[model samples]
Target: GSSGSSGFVKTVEDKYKCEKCHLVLCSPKQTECGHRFCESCMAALLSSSSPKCTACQESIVKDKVF
Candidate 1:
């Protein structure tokens, strides 16, 4: 059975938000530039050449992310 939805109010810290999607981090990954992105988002961004951090505009390398 599906759980019922209740009036749940929660606030998320700014640091926990994904820089690219502007949503709560999912499988969060940090870049060398100190910016956070979702693992999926990071992969999408890096799909192109010379991808830059959405928050810091710093160059991003696939190996540089954790």
Candidate 2:
């Protein structure tokens, strides 16, 4: 049987955590580097021709957002 804390194991401490906004992600989008961010945050970053991934700071393309 699963313990009461089993449900807590599935918490979105990472997957739902958005680095750009420093809050739980709403409409989360994944980057090529596998970092997640709020869709709006990604859009704002990509408004410029060059954007770096929030997690790795790696150069990423607008298309990398999905």
Candidate 3:
């Protein structure tokens, strides 16, 4: 049995809590910005020539299973 919390996990969010800019959660979690995301979601997002994070508007490195 499991009870989902009302809020997202702190570990997940902490990874992307970039001090330089504002970002909720960067997509490609494997990039290890400290945020978390499902592998499938990250794979898709990184499957582009120039994979960039939706948040912070930064370029994302590809092939990482985040």
Candidate 4:
């Protein structure tokens, strides 16, 4: 679980970027709200009692991430 892709030498597509890290997704997870984040980043966000998607500000459930 990382914040984002590090040392990625090749060009990355926008679809591969993480909303939280603003970098290529590393161990990406998609929230039900349709935003993506690195697994670790998502975990950190959801560590709180009330977690919201950073991109859309939608309520996030731990089990709803994929």
Candidate 5:
């Protein structure tokens, strides 16, 4: 219909610094727990058997680790 098209950038490279255990995990899945820790880290958090988030210290359950 139009001569050309324009694209909108809903999300781009954040270009922000993320510090997690001296390791930079890219495109890591974020959780409501506010923990940017990698998948491996989440395992420990769940094993704790505590609803508290290991990062923000928020109360969440193992099922919520997703």
Candidate 6:
């Protein structure tokens, strides 16, 4: 037993990030095709018809992002 114990500092890494922004997720959304992106970026990127994933060319269905 030591005189005192050191505390555990919790460091974290974001598992999901926006491909366009390349930043940690904030209000992140995931598409059916299994890609994560920030809400604003996804919204803007999907503003047009036949939306596609910014990270990939995979076709994205509407309302699949959540």
* Clash number by candidate, in order: 0, 0, 3, 0, 1, 0
lDDT of each: 0.74, 0.68, 0.48, 0.75, 0.53, 0.71
TM-score for each of the candidates: 0.62, 0.58, 0.37, 0.63, 0.49, 0.62
lDDT of 4 by residue, 18-45 (tens): 7877768645677788888876777878
Please, what are the lDDT tens digits per residue for candidate 6 over residues 1-66? 656465554556336788778767755777767777776677777875767888775755556667
Given candidate 1, what's the lDDT at residue 64? 78
- Model 4 residue runs over 4 Å out of place are 1-15
Best by lDDT: 4
TM-score, predicted candidate 1 vs. hidden true structure: 0.62
Query: Model 2, residue 23: what's the lDDT?
Result: 64
Q: Which stretches of candidate 3 lie over 4 Å from their true place?
A: 1-36, 62-66
RMSD (Cα, Å) for all candidates, in order, is 8.0, 4.2, 9.6, 11.0, 4.4, 4.3
* Best-to-worst TM-score order: 4, 6, 1, 2, 5, 3
For candidate 3, write residues 1-66 as lDDT tens digits.
898778756554333432223434554254534333444545555677666554443555654433
> Lowest-lDDT window of 10 residues in candidate 1?
6-15
- Tens digit per residue, CA lDDT, model 1, 1-66: 886486555674345667977767645667778888887778877876878888877867778776
Candidate 6 local distance difference test against the native: 0.71
Q: Candidate 1, after superposition: displacement of residue 40 in Å? A: 2.2
Q: Give a tens-digit lDDT track for model 5, residues 1-66.
A: 755455655666453212245346665535565655556665566567764555567754545533
Quick one: RMSD of model 5? 4.4
